[PDB]
Design a protein around this ligand. Structure first.
Ligand code: CLA
Ligand code: CLA
Ligand code: CLA
Ligand code: CLA
Ligand code: CLA
Ligand code: CLA
Ligand code: CLA
Ligand SMILES: CC1=C(C#C/C(C)=C/C=C/C(C)=C/C=C/C=C(C)/C=C/C=C(\C)C#CC2=C(C)C[C@@H](O)CC2(C)C)C(C)(C)C[C@H](O)C1
Ligand SMILES: CC1=C(C#C/C(C)=C/C=C/C(C)=C/C=C/C=C(C)/C=C/C=C(\C)C#CC2=C(C)C[C@@H](O)CC2(C)C)C(C)(C)C[C@H](O)C1
Ligand SMILES: CC1=CCCC(C)(C)[C@H]1/C=C/C(C)=C/C=C/C(C)=C/C=C/C=C(C)/C=C/C=C(C)/C=C/C1=C(C)CCCC1(C)C
Ligand SMILES: CC1=CCCC(C)(C)[C@H]1/C=C/C(C)=C/C=C/C(C)=C/C=C/C=C(C)/C=C/C=C(C)/C=C/C1=C(C)CCCC1(C)C
Lengths: 175, 179, 34, 90, 732, 30, 162
């Protein structure tokens, strides 16, 4: 009836409890305007990119390839001091991977569990209930990494250092 | 290999169509390109400088026609409107090349959107900032000559701009990127 | 003019071949039973 | 030709009586004719006073006198609402 | 047999009439076979996206061709001496003298000089180089595609809106007032403050530096303090050289009034404050109607409640809400009447209050722009009345409109039509009568017996705005008046400078010649209204055809019985008012142009004395100014006015060819065509070739349309050739 | 000045508009 | 209409394949031809006095077409007149550009036709796809590198031609 996370709000109709990650948190009624299968696919894809991106931010600041144009450890500034032919090559490759994984489908066409793209080559999901636990893990770490990557990139715009560098030396004695 | 005088676009092909795997060879073809986004911004800035500098004799040739006339007036409006448009565009582009040449990748948008609080090194600490100073003084000379009525003053000052901008390009040797 | 060759290419095509082709194909469309 | 939609809360406002039904007043349907009439004079006096105080308009006008000057046309709608309510027995 | 796929009645016609009629009926989707109301609104929705893209493609092409082939950068340096270039010429029919004659503009190739004013508009709003002209062209190419895709997308089965969406009057009005009108007026205020005004002051502001360049030195701090007047401080000096830093101020929001002294155009800070203020007002307006949150008005409730209790309007506006919502022709007529008035305001306020720098020294551009928009205005005004006639025939239901304002209009239509008939005749008898009196009296050597009425009412209105030319000393012209004292701290000083200099077109001096032409223009407005109102009000029925509504909007006649019924349809009154619309815009644009070319020479007294009789208009305007135009080529050479000299003759040719369709009618032509059909079948080697469509004479209605188009096209091409070449040839 | 490559960019984008105009026109035609 | 072998059909695929193979030959041939200067008076600008206003170009210098460009165009005019005569009056055995209206379309090849090394239709279609791809490839390579198409072709072939 009421929303589990937002006690004064009613529970959105399109949630129903069954779908993984539900604490009744849909105040702005986005599920009434869009299909939730597409929304979850977007949320999973966003969180997966964000987990990769946050891991990229930390590891790039610690280590980089033994080449010039990779030395810079600030993620934002690293994007620019690097061959752009390589960057577009990644962009094209991402376009390929997106097509094959989604089996050449559009918004209606994509719907198959949402986000189950089949790219799990190793048999981690042995127990299906352990799979469900990993699904909750996947969305929670993905949601955390979306905010976490956003904080890292905006720290990098502010501090100009990168994630671990911005944390270790944060200027307590000024704004 | 150089920048078109009027368009300021990479003109020569550079004779580099190498597909070359392994070593990229800076293959001017996209996805074989070895140029950074910063290098491409630098070539755009250099192209702006070429357009401005090639336009400098247009003012010189126009001012010579003015002086030759039956009665000479030194159109202060033309001289100023050239300076407000073409000459200021030169200085700002020269400053931006210096900014990228000194701070590095941060000026390419690494630090984010242009802000009132730029968190990078300024256009100073550059070996080619001295050339920017020459153009800035020349702009002041161009305006001062126009207010005074000195035809020779405008012509010499524009020549000073032309030498300074050419000097800037030669020391910088801006990377010619066609992608 | 930059790319000065373009008017001498595009104006005969736009002015002669383009109407010559739309008149030819419109005539076929307006004079077909099915 | 197809049903023409209107916002929810649309009611019938056509009248052939002496005064329209109080429904034409919207949120002010329950305000008394005395309360509009006193608001009508108040808005007219304050609106005229605020208007009068800034007739030579400057580059620094008092923003309260500008905002208070909008009470003068607002008073016109107030006495019309006062006439409507008086003739509906409110 | 299948071209009019929307009309089985035309696709089974075996004549050449099928091709003509299928083309002329293509956009009348309401009449197409098997048209529902769902599909009618959905095709109109998509073809509105398609029209929008055509407007964006037209604009990108003007930007591209100037960036590519123009002299924008040279013009920007010296805008009063350089003549702007529209596009280059590649014509293989040219001789070598023609190629040389069109090689003006400071370039090495034949070019057409621009009369559109786009150079002055793009300069004023910020554009300085060819590279941002081209950047704008690229954006419009993108926008045209985005709106082409949106048109296709909203025709897709899931994205096709329902009729309930298309008839949400309150939500569309809320968004179009507060977003389409209001927010974009606010966004245009932002562009001027952030780009146009800084670049008018020498400082380049583009996407590269806009987020790090403050429009004001204080900078969005006075706004968040209520110290708004700190943004009017230090306006541009009267010594300011537009485009440069010399004489420049720091203000971004002023109400100075008058013109920038060097550009002779409105201040850019007045224009930015205009759009900020208009934008705020419109956003507030866009909160009037109730959509989803319980505040606002029902449009149906407002209309139902506005019946005056005295009963003079009957049931008032009860049932108008449904009548307007269900009739797209009623909506179109209101839109075209409203649009028609605005494009006339645009023509009037842009010549008297120009906003673009150094325009109004471009006498050709100033003349072409006025002529263009008054002609657009006259077409829009005819179309509104035509679609009001189409509404009554097709969409008006008398039983849902019992005793409305609409039904009561039709109840006294003879009172309306006869009083237009009287006022037209009243104006016509005496306006023509005074002019003929003046001509005869001037012809007999006695110009002092002319009837010269001083237009005191308009002169008093000029004086009320501060014009100190007629000694009226009223309101703003009066030094010690409540009106004059109220505006003294704001726009009065700048406006009085602008209106009391005889160096612009703000409230131009007027006399007896201006009095006479305004009453001629009044005659032509009431007579055009008469034909159109009579067409709208007699559309449903008359005494000749009481069942005229059963036949449609455009039908030829009801035959030769009952005395004869040629031109009896409501369409035929559109046809007849089109001649009167062309005549009126002629009288308006002839007046505007002669009054301006005489002033621009310094010889306003030539208009003052010669405009009071019709021979002055014939010899001192048409005959005198013809000579540079008709000498564009001659046996002694040609110059760049040769194209207008050819368009001039071309226009006389199209205009006269229209007379053939208007004077000679079908029966003569069908009988000739039968002799041509015979000859083809009987000619050897030629009867091997056969027509698929039997050749027939044009229809009765079609010939009226063909003659009207030829008449109208000839009218436009002739005047445009004259108004541009005579102004170009004179430069004054 | 405008480079020929810049003209070619415009011809690409106007070609994209020609393809979208055909598709919108075919949808309107049914 | 479109049932005569026009549009995205295998008939159009084959015909465009043949033209692109010829076009690759012609591009190589002109690269070699103007590399050695065997086009006579290649830079000489045609005079409007002889040829009329079709010769005008409006490039700032000369204001006329060059002789090389005119010669290449006249070569293309030779094969265009051949093209028209072959389209409207084809040979008895020749594959026709348009079709009977009730013809049976050749079966689409797919990803790659059977490798028949003869003077076969499989070899023709494979080589035609390859040549069309090569045309595009050469165009894009020349546009991005900034070089001329004639130079781009020479460099891809290892500067054999010149
Ligand atoms: C289709 C297969 C393919 C091919 C032929 C290449 C070939 C190339 N890549 Mg690409 N690449 C590929 C797949 C491929 N890569 C994939 C799957 C990815 C991940 C999306 C990338 C991501 C990538 C990046 C990010 C970069 C390259 C770069 C390069 C160039 C350097 C060569 C090399 O081996 O560097 C390895 C280094 C050595 C052998 C040391 C000497 C070369 C032209 C680099 C380049 O020059 O930019 C174009 C570059 O920056 N590539
Ligand atoms: C929920 C969305 C969101 C929010 C609240 C913020 C909030 C912020 N962003 Mg981020 N940003 C976002 C999405 C968001 N961002 C995304 C999606 C992008 C990619 C286009 C960026 C790219 C971006 C840059 C490049 C920069 C910021 C900056 C900023 C700061 C505001 C000042 C400014 O120039 O804003 C600009 C806001 C946008 C460009 C978003 C559109 C602030 C911390 C600036 C800053 O000071 O760094 C912390 C800065 O330089 N943002
Ligand atoms: C001459 C113009 C005019 C008139 C007579 C009215 C009259 C009215 N308006 Mg409207 N209104 C107007 C202009 C006008 N408004 C404009 C320009 C806006 C845009 C800002 C609004 C926006 C508006 C809203 C949003 C609401 C009203 C409401 C009302 C009613 C409230 C009466 C009241 O306050 O009682 C004491 C009243 C019938 C309220 C209502 O009930 O509407 C029916 C309401 O919620 N008005
Ligand atoms: C804020 C949201 C918003 C916005 C921006 C728009 C915008 C638009 N809608 Mg609307 N629409 C909305 C919400 C919105 N809509 C909603 C919520 C609904 C559903 C209830 C609709 C339903 C709807 C329908 C059914 C249709 C539109 C249409 C249109 C287009 C109108 C035609 C046009 O270009 O006029 C542009 C008008 C202006 C810019 C303002 C008018 C300017 C006046 C005439 C004078 C200006 C003078 C000024 C000096 C200009 C100077 C020019 C310069 C050269 C100097 C326009 C793009 C129509 C269309 O074309 O479809 C594509 C259409 O058929 N809309
Ligand atoms: C935004 C403006 C606008 C719009 C949407 C329309 C739309 C329409 N008009 Mg209106 N009209 C307009 C402006 C407009 N007109 C103006 C300015 C005039 C005055 C010149 C007219 C005069 C007018 C008349 C006299 C008639 C129309 C008719 C029509 C309809 C069919 C047009 C057709 O098939 O010709 C398409 C033509 C071609 C495709 C060939 C070129 C269509 C509903 C006709 C109709 O069917 O109404 C019943 C009709 O008889 N209109
Ligand atoms: C110069 C050309 C011309 C003139 C003068 C007129 C005049 C008139 N038209 Mg016509 N009209 C014309 C061209 C012209 N039209 C054309 C080309 C078209 C397009 C087909 C139309 C279409 C048209 C329509 C559709 C309508 C008019 C209407 C009118 C009247 C509008 C002006 C008015 O009401 O009072 C002006 C009055 C006059 C000009 C009359 C002149 C006074 C005379 C000359 C007195 C002289 C007496 C003299 C002694 C006679 C000597 C005879 C001799 C043998 C002894 C008026 C009778 C409207 C109308 O009749 O409404 C009432 C109307 O509905 N006209
Ligand atoms: C038309 C057929 C053709 C022919 C005859 C050749 C022949 C040759 N090419 Mg190759 N090449 C071809 C197509 C061809 N290519 C294609 C389609 C491309 C992609 C655009 C290239 C890209 C290419 C590069 C990037 C280079 C060559 C080079 C060379 C020459 C010497 C080195 C070598 O064996 O390269 C090995 C052969 C191949 C890579 C392709 C076979 C050699 C004569 C080299 C040279 O001297 O260039 C100046 C060199 O660096 N080629
Ligand atoms: C699925 C599965 C397999 C797999 C797999 C893979 C690829 C697994 C990889 C998983 C990854 C990369 C997880 C990383 C998550 C990052 C997080 C949670 C951080 C958020 C940021 C935070 C808290 C922060 C912060 C910071 C801020 C904002 C400012 C900073 O100055 C400082 C600070 C650090 C404090 C594969 C495909 C191999 C096969 C198999 O068959 C199935
Ligand atoms: C090259 C060239 C010519 C030519 C040609 C032709 C027919 C060029 C045709 C090029 C075509 C039709 C290319 C098709 C590309 C589609 C792709 C790559 C998508 C795949 C999925 C001609 C014959 C005019 C001669 C000219 O002297 C040079
Ligand atoms: C009236 C009308 C009817 C029906 C309804 C309607 C749709 C709404 C309406 C709309 C009509 C509309 C909106 C009509 C719009 C018509 C338009 C926008 C036509 C544009 C044509 C552009 C062309 C052919 C350029 C091609 C450039 C090329 C091939 C360059 C290529 C290249 C070069 C050299 C360089 C790059 C590489 C390659 C690729 C090699
Ligand atoms: C035919 C047809 C059939 C039925 C349907 C239909 C479509 C509706 C119809 C079409 C009808 C059509 C086509 C109708 C066309 C109608 C038109 C064109 C109406 C024009 C209205 C202009 C007005 C009221 C100007 C008012 C100015 C004022 C008050 C200025 C005041 C002042 C100010 C503020 C400033 C200065 C001082 C003063 C002077 C004091």
């Amino acid at each position: 009836d009421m929303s589990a996370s937002v006690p004064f709000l009613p529970r959105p109709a399109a949630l129903d409890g069954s779908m993984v990650g539900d604490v009744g948190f849909d105040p702005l009624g986005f599920t009434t305007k869009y299909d939730i299968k597409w929304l979850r696919e977007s949320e999973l894809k966003h969180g997966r990119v964000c987990m990769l991106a946050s891991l990229g931010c930390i590891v790039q600041e610690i280590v980089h390839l033994p080449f010039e144009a990779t030395s810079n450890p600030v993620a934002s500034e690293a994007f620019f001091q690097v061959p752009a032919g390589g960057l577009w090559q990644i962009f094209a490759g991402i376009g390929i991977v997106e097509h094959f994984s989604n089996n050449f489908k559009m918004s209606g066409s994509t719907m198959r569990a949402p986000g189950n793209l089949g790219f799990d080559p190793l048999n981690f999901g042995k127990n299906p209930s352990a799979r469900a636990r990993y699904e909750l893990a996947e969305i929670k770490n993905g949601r955390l990494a979306m905010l976490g990557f956003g904080g890292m990139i905006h720290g990098c715009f502010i501090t100009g250092k990168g994630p671990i560098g911005a944390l270790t030396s944060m200027d307590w004695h000024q704004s | 290999a150089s920048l078109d005088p009027k368009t300021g676009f990479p003109i020569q092909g550079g004779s580099r169509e190498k597909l070359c795997g392994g070593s990229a060879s800076a293959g001017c073809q996209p996805m074989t390109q070895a140029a950074s986004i910063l290098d491409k911004q630098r070539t755009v800035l250099a192209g702006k400088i070429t357009v401005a500098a090639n336009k400098v004799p247009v003012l010189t040739a126009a001012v010579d026609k003015m002086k030759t006339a039956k009665k000479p007036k030194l159109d202060r409006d033309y001289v100023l409107r050239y300076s407000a448009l073409y000459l200021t565009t030169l200085v700002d582009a020269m400053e931006q090349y210096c900014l990228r040449d000194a701070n590095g990748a941060k000026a390419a948008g690494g630090a984010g959107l242009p802000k009132f609080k730029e968190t990078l090194k300024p256009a100073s600490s550059s070996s080619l900032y001295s050339y920017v100073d020459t153009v800035k003084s020349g702009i002041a000379a161009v305006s001062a000559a126009a207010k005074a009525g000195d035809f020779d003053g405008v012509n010499k000052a524009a020549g000073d701009i032309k030498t300074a901008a050419d000097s800037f390009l030669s020391t910088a040797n801006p990377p010619i990127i066609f992608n | 003019m930059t790319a000065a060759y373009l008017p001498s290419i595009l104006v005969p095509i736009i002015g002669l071949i383009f109407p010559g082709l739309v008149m030819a194909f419109a005539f076929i469309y307006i004079e077909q039973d099915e | 030709f197809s049903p023409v939609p209107s916002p929810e809360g649309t009611k019938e406002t056509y009248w052939e009586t002496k005064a329209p039904s109080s429904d034409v007043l919207g949120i002010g349907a329950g305000v008394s004719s005395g309360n509009f009439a006193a608001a009508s004079v108040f808005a007219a006096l304050v609106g005229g006073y605020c208007t009068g105080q800034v007739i030579p308009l400057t580059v620094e006008p008092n923003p309260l006198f500008l905002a208070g000057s909008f009470l003068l046309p607002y008073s016109w709608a107030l006495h019309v609402a006062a006439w409507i309510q008086k003739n509906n027995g409110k | 047999t299948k071209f009019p796929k929307f009309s089985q009645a035309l696709a089974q016609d075996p004549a050449t009439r099928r091709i003509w009629y299928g083309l002329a009926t293509a956009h009348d989707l309401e009449s197409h076979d098997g048209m529902t109301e769902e599909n009618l609104y959905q095709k109109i929705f998509a073809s509105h996206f398609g029209h929008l893209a055509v407007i964006f493609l037209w604009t990108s092409g003007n930007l591209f061709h100037v960036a590519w082939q123009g002299n924008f950068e040279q013009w920007v340096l010296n805008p009063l001496k350089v003549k702007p270039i529209a596009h280059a010429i590649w014509d293989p029919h040219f001789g070598q003298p023609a190629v040389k004659a069109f090689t003006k503009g400071g370039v090495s190739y034949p070019v057409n000089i621009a009369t559109s004013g786009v150079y002055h508009w793009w300069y004023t709003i910020g554009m300085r180089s060819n590279t941002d002209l081209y950047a704008g062209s690229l954006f419009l190419l993108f926008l045209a595609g985005v709106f082409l895709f949106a048109g296709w997308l909203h025709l897709q089965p899931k994205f096709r809106p329902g009729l309930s969406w298309f008839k949400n009057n309150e939500s569309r009005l809320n968004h179009h007032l507060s977003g389409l009108f209001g927010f974009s007026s606010l966004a245009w205020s932002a562009h001027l403050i952030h780009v146009a005004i800084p670049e008018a002051r020498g400082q380049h502001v583009c996407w590269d530096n806009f987020t790090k360049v403050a429009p004001h030195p204080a900078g969005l701090q006075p706004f968040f303090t209520g110290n708004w007047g700190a943004y009017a401080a230090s306006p541009d000096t009267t010594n300011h050289i537009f485009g440069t830093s010399e004489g420049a101020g720091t203000a971004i929001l002023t109400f100075l009034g008058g013109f920038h002294p060097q550009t002779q155009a409105l201040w850019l800070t007045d224009i930015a404050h205009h759009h900020l203020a208009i934008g705020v007002v419109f956003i507030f307006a866009g909160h009037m109607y109730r959509t989803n949150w319980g505040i606002g008005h029902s449009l149906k409730e407002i209309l139902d409640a506005h019946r005056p209790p005295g009963g003079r309007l009957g049931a008032g506006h009860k049932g108008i809400f449904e009548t307007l919502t269900n009739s797209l022709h009623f909506q179109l007529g209101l839109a075209l009447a409203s649009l028609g008035v605005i494009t006339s305001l645009v023509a009037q306020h842009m010549y008297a209050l120009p906003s673009y720098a150094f325009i109004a020294k471009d006498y050709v551009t100033q003349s072409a722009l006025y002529t263009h928009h008054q002609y657009i205005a006259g077409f829009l005004m005819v179309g509104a009345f035509a679609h009001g006639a189409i509404f009554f025939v097709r969409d008006y239901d008398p039983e849902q409109n019992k005793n409305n304002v609409l039904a009561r209009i039709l109840d006294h239509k003879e009172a309306i039509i006869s009083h237009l008939s009287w006022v037209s005749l009243f104006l016509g008898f005496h306006t023509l009568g005074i002019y003929v009196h003046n001509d005869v009296v001037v012809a007999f050597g006695t110009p002092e017996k002319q009837i010269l009425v001083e237009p005191v009412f308009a002169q008093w209105i000029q004086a009320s705005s501060g014009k100190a030319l007629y000694g009226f000393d009223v309101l703003l012209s009066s030094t010690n008046s409540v009106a004059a004292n109220a505006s003294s701290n704001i726009w009065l000083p700048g406006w009085l400078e602008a209106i009391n200099s005889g160096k612009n077109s703000l409230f131009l001096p007027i006399g007896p010649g201006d009095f006479l032409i305004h009453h001629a223009i009044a005659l032509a407005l009431h007579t055009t209204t008469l034909i159109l109102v009579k067409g709208a009000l007699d559309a449903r029925g008359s005494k000749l055809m009481p069942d005229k509504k059963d036949f449609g909007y455009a039908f030829p006649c009801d035959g030769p019985g009952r005395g004869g019924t040629c031109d009896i349809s409501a369409w035929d009154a559109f046809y007849l008012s089109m001649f009167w619309m062309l005549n009126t815009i002629g009288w308006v644009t002839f007046y505007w142009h002669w009054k301006h070319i005489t002033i621009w020479q310094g010889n306003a007294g030539q208009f003052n004395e010669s405009s009071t009789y019709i021979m002055g208009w014939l010899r001192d305007y048409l005959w005198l100014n013809s000579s540079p135009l008709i000498n564009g080529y001659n046996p002694f050479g040609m110059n760049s006015l040769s194209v207008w000299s050819w368009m001039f003759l071309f226009g006389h040719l199209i205009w006269a060819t229209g007379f053939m369709f208007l004077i000679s009618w079908r029966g003569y032509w069908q009988e000739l065509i039968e002799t041509l059909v015979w000859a083809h079948e009987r000619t050897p080697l030629a009867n091997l070739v056969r027509w698929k469509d039997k050749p027939v004479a044009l229809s009765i209605v079609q010939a009226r349309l063909v003659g009207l188009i030829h008449f109208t096209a000839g009218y436009i091409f002739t005047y445009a050739a004259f108004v541009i070449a005579s102004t170009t040839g004179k430069f004054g | 000045m405008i480079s020929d490559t810049q003209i070619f960019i415009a011809l690409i984008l106007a070609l994209v508009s020609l393809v979208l105009a055909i598709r919108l026109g075919r949808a309107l035609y049914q | 209409f479109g049932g005569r072998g026009l549009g995205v059909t295998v008939n159009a695929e084959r015909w465009n394949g043949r033209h692109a193979m010829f076009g690759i030959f012609a591009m190589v041939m002109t690269s070699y031809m103007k590399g050695h200067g065997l086009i006579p008076d290649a830079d000489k600008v045609l005079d409007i006095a002889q040829w009329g206003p079709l010769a005008a170009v409006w490039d700032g210098a000369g204001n006329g077409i060059s002789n090389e460009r005119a010669i290449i165009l006249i070569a293309h005019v030779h094969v265009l007149v051949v093209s028209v005569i072959a389209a409207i009056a084809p040979f008895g055995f020749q594959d026709t550009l348009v079709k009977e209206k009730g013809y049976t379309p050749e079966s689409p090849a797919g990803l790659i036709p059977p490798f028949k090394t003869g003077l076969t239709a499989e070899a023709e279609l494979i080589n035609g796809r390859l040549a069309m791809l090569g045309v595009i490839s050469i165009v894009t390579a020349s546009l991005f590198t900034g070089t001329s198409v004639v130079d781009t072709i020479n460099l891809g072939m290892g500067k054999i031609l010149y």
